[PDB]
């Protein structure tokens, strides 16, 4: 099975599987039932921004999601990723729709990771920044319904030609190169992730959400994980 | 008076004023009596590295000081700098000697600060990296006994021609430009500081230490702040 | 007696002093009479972007000015800055108006400079990025009519309350810290400058232009340098 | 066949195939016979540094190779990479030995690539920095005799237990993710490469050299490319 650590931007409450009775952001550690959540006042049709950060000194994973001229939603959870994830992982974005839909458009995405080992200035680093996505984005592994090129944007889930969002859709984009998330002999290790999105929903309720995730290198979308599973988990356990 | 927030690498225990009975690292918030300290196994004559980090999401200031092939010392303290420091500050390094001495040589120093406001990718940032210090380092404000140029290093305190450290010395180096440490309308704000040092002590005990500090723009060495005061505080209150 | 090296975005042709008969961009080395120019199809009322780059290996100063979905204007000139400028300089933006006007609005400005000396990874660097300008921008030295805060932008020249541009206006913005542009023992040295602007002109012709400049630390606006002198030169020599 | 653009650090002159009669650095565009070379005073047993740069404004590829307290070797060639290389490529380091040998040790390697298309601050970037190489370096594709982990270094060619170099050896290291080297709608595009090496040769003459290269994504070591072919070319044409 895949080892998943994700920060979810959950637009649809599934109170039956542990979701809060309102849209929220949460920290998922190997389960869709977030170890921590915070109320999120999602704004339909508006471009928002998410920022996720973590460092081995504090061993705390935090995220802030906000819209311009609007209060932000913050969520933090104490977790030592050395004990949860493998040394080498892959990072990506995931999204899904179920009975209800919304567009899960990504306008930009950047990530920076640094590892300092026991030596002078000996820091290994990785950084990538996407502001425009091309039709042939070779450095991205697109899974499921995810597609690039539409207006230079990344469409995680299926959107028809007339621009309307489709139900029962799942899609992910993983950066091509494996990321060395930690090392036993590292003094300091940290990562920063930032992405802007546009969740637009024409129907009754928006669903199901977007999630930033870290996984084992060979991770793939679990079969049937549309809807509430965010394309990350095989079941709601 | 000056508003000081510093991370001290205290090599000499002054138990009479609140120091632990062993070398330690500490977080000083407007007073030399650290709000938080951690035992530090200082290694005489060896190059060490210090890393300090802070972000407005967690509102926690942390630091790690280590030597190669050696366990590190970590210290963290929850503090909202918005309520402590002014919006515009100056960052620097400070060091002192008293009856007992040590060299307070800085081999490198880098700093990165970022402020994200309520707007798309609207991030203001400042970054500087010093690996070599020249005889005429115009972007540094040297105070007291601090001098640059000797072997491309920054000597915070007085070191004789023969290379031996002098007692009763104080010196600081502040980066020339004021730093916008925070702003009421910032979504995220963070800073990272890193510096390598070389503390060498020929005499009985090493004293007194090095400190990374953030202060009011016009800060200056208080008179008589050699020894235990680290060139940062006027008294031991 | 300032030593000036600037890249001009000349919106008004003053053929009487050497300007081409059309808007152009040029490389000015101690004189308003560009050593090199290129036709520039300036677009009234549109946000444009300028990029300047230089490296000691090629000893060539290049710039590209473009507007979205439009052809760019490029200008390059072979010049060894070690022979032209002092070791320590200051960098800034300048703008002026005369009988004719235009707004010289700066929306963003970033600069990065690196110096690699004869040592392993021993690089000294400086980087600052401005996407938003505040009312109290302490790390900037505003000269002449330059002001910050207006909609988070940098207005180099005088703009009325209603927004209309004023004639006979000069203004500059220099970054607070001195920049080590070069060093005799440097293997490689390079710098990159990028800024976006908005030149809007209601009157007959736009005038006079914007310029990115490098100067001696203590440089200041020459008396009477409004109009064709761009706030950089004392005369048309 | 592979499309190769490389900067060679040729330690062994093969005059019979066009090599100058002295160690040299060169720019190879699809052939082992450099379009441009420069005399290089290689220092046996000393750590050196190589810096390569390119930008679409000047369309010139330059490189500087130097040793501390020593004069550098510079080589530049005017070439538009849009006409030579495909849009997506892979970057790496290559080295070889033949009848004569040397160690082709890489101590560090960093790369930065940026593409700015027709849009505000819309820049796509990639940056990776390697100061330490681990035994299980997953983000690198090791070809031939290349190995990592030995003292945290990258040994491009075969070296024994006692550290001595082996003859008739070839090896390469390519970064895992494909690099978008160019795009038809990009205003500016640039890349920078830096790496430190240690060429040590116990035998009569050092051979054959190290090279930084850009190639088609699926490139692999040509059959029989040991010796003078630097593991990049199938023949000496
Ligand atoms: O796209 C949203 C949703 O679609 C699919 O589920 C449809 C409905 O399925 C079950 O009926 C319910 O889970 C329902 O959820 C509502 O009712 C629950 C029980 O009353 C309650 O606990 C929930 O909080 C909610 O009010 C679903 O709407 C499927 O794709 C889901 O995975 C997906 O989340
Ligand atoms: O450079 C070290 C120290 O030098 C100067 O003080 C010298 C001594 O001054 C006082 O005697 C004491 O504070 C002493 O400290 C020792 O004794 C204390 C009392 O027994 C004890 O609490 C301390 O922990 C320590 O054992 C000093 O050594 C002066 O410049 C000081 O500022 C400076 O720290
Ligand atoms: O703001 C533009 C301009 O305003 C001020 O000069 C106004 C006029 O001053 C002089 O008459 C001329 O230089 C004139 O320039 C035009 O005519 C010239 C002669 O025919 C010709 O060489 C020029 O190319 C141009 O067509 C100006 O219009 C003063 O502030 C100037 O510095 C400023 O550039
Ligand atoms: O590692 C060096 C070299 O080893 C292998 O070639 C060995 C020799 O092969 C041929 O004899 C020659 O090319 C010789 O080169 C010398 O002599 C040439 C003719 O006089 C002269 O042009 C050359 O400049 C050189 O002095 C080689 O030494 C094989 O692996 C080669 O690929 C490899 O370069
Ligand atoms: Ca849900
Ligand atoms: Ca003390
Ligand atoms: Ca003019
Ligand atoms: Ca050769
Ligand atoms: Mn949830
Ligand atoms: Mn103390
Ligand atoms: Mn002109
Ligand atoms: Mn050659």
């Amino acid at each position: 099975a895949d080892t998943i650590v994700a920060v979810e931007l959950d637009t649809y409450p599934n109170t039956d599987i542990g979701d809060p009775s309102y849209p929220h952001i949460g920290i998922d550690i190997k389960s869709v039932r977030s170890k921590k959540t915070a109320k999120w006042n999602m704004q339909n049709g508006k471009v928002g921004t998410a920022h996720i950060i973590y460092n081995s000194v504090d061993k705390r994973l935090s995220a802030v999601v906000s819209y311009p001229n609007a209060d932000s939603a913050t969520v933090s959870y104490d977790v030592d990723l050395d004990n949860v994830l493998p040394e080498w992982v892959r990072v990506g974005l995931s999204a899904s729709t179920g009975l209800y839909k919304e567009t899960n458009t990504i306008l930009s995405w950047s990530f920076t990771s640094k590892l300092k080992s026991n030596s002078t200035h000996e820091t290994n680093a990785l950084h990538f920044m996407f502001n425009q996505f091309s039709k042939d984005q070779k450095d991205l592994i697109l899974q499921g319904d995810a597609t690039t090129g539409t207006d230079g944007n990344l469409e995680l889930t299926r959107v028809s030609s007339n621009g309307s969002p489709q139900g029962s859709s799942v899609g992910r984009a993983l950066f091509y190169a494996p990321v060395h998330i930690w090392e036993s002999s590292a003094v300091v290790a940290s990562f920063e992730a930032t992405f802007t999105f546009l969740i637009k929903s024409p129907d009754s309720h928006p669903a199901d959400g977007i999630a930033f995730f870290i996984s084992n290198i060979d991770s793939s979308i679990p079969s049937g994980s549309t809807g509430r599973l965010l394309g990350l988990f095989p079941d709601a356990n």
Side-chain angles (χ1 to χ4, degrees), chain A:
Chain A
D2 296 342
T3 295
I4 303 279
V5 174
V7 174
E8 54 164 71
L9 272 59
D10 207 350
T11 56
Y12 192 85
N14 298 104
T15 68
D16 56 324
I17 56 156
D19 272 2
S21 48
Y22 46 67
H24 50 291
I25 55 174
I27 291 181
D28 303 341
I29 306 289
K30 298 186 302 180
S31 164
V32 72
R33 299 180 183 242
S34 328
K35 300 301 187 185
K36 193 66 175 186
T37 62
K39 186 162 187 179
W40 172 43
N41 285 282
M42 188 269 297
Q43 281 164 243
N44 192 355
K46 301 198 188 171
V47 173
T49 306
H51 188 68
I52 299 94
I53 52 191
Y54 175 91
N55 80 76
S56 54
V57 178
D58 293 334
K59 292 177 184 303
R60 191 159 193 247
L61 180 56
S62 310
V64 184
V65 173
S66 54
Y67 291 95
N69 291 151
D71 301 307
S72 63
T74 286
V75 74
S76 195
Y77 180 74
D78 295 312
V79 61
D80 187 2
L81 301 184
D82 311 338
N83 298 331
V84 184
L85 294 167
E87 191 162 308
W88 288 86
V89 300
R90 260 203 170 111
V91 301
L93 289 175
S94 192
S96 64
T97 56
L99 172 58
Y100 293 112
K101 49 269 176 187
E102 73 192 18
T103 55
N104 297 112
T105 315
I106 302 296
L107 291 77
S108 68
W109 178 29
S110 60
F111 176 86
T112 301
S113 196
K114 280 174 281 174
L115 257 182
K116 185 179 185 172
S117 296
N118 290 102
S119 281
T120 30
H121 207 326
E122 282 200 357
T123 292
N124 271 26
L126 170 67
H127 166 76
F128 66 77
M129 173 172 64
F130 291 110
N131 277 306
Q132 182 117 34
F133 297 101
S134 59
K135 205 176 177 186
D136 189 35
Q137 194 69 37
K138 299 188 190 297
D139 53 0
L140 281 188
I141 293 177
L142 302 179
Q143 299 181 338
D145 303 324
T147 57
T148 56
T150 312
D151 304 319
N153 298 324
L154 169 65
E155 296 286 18
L156 285 176
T157 48
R158 203 172 197 249
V159 171
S160 65
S161 54
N162 63 48
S164 60
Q166 312 282 270
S168 304
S169 188
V170 237
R172 306 159 143 202
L174 291 86
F175 184 61
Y176 206 86
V179 182
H180 199 172
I181 211 68
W182 60 263
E183 194 206 358
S184 44
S185 311
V187 177
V188 188
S190 57
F191 77 73
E192 166 175 333
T194 302
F195 62 93
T196 56
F197 54 92
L198 174 49
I199 293 176
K200 202 186 313 177
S201 182
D203 61 328
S204 322
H205 307 261
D208 276 87
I210 298 180
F212 166 67
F213 70 91
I214 306 180
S215 74
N216 42 297
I217 290 172
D218 56 339
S219 169
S220 50
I221 310 178
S223 303
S225 63
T226 50
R228 60 154 93 139
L229 300 180
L230 313 167
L232 300 169
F233 312 98
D235 47 54
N237 299 160

